[PDB]
Amino acid sequence: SGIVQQQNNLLRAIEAQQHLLQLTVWGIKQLQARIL
Amino acid sequence: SGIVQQQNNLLRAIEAQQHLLQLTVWGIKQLQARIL
């Protein structure tokens, strides 16, 4: 559905990658705290 | 090469960031398993 649909496609991909990113941050903080 | 080329540019950046994201997930899982 054109360039406009592809822009919504990419925004949704970025938003979901951000959820993944915050999960990886959470995990790193959990582990750092246990080690240090 | 216009808006269409820039959309392919951004999709490729997102896709490669996803490969990085899955590598960081792998590392966190490796470490969590060893600690816990």
Binding site: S1, G2, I3, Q5, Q6, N9, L10, R12, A13, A16, Q17, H19, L20, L23, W26, G27, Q30 | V4, Q7, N8, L11, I14, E15, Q18, Q22, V25, Q32, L36
Partner: peptide, 29 residues
């Protein structure tokens, strides 16, 4: 860590689906 595993899997499949969808939209353009 159980909820972490479930959300990682949830968002990974969501992102994979969005990337495929965008690839199909890109080849059309």
């Amino acid at each position: 860590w159980e909820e972490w595993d479930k959300k990682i899997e949830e968002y990974t499949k969501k992102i994979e689906e969005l990337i495929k969808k965008s690839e199909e939209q890109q080849k059309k353009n």
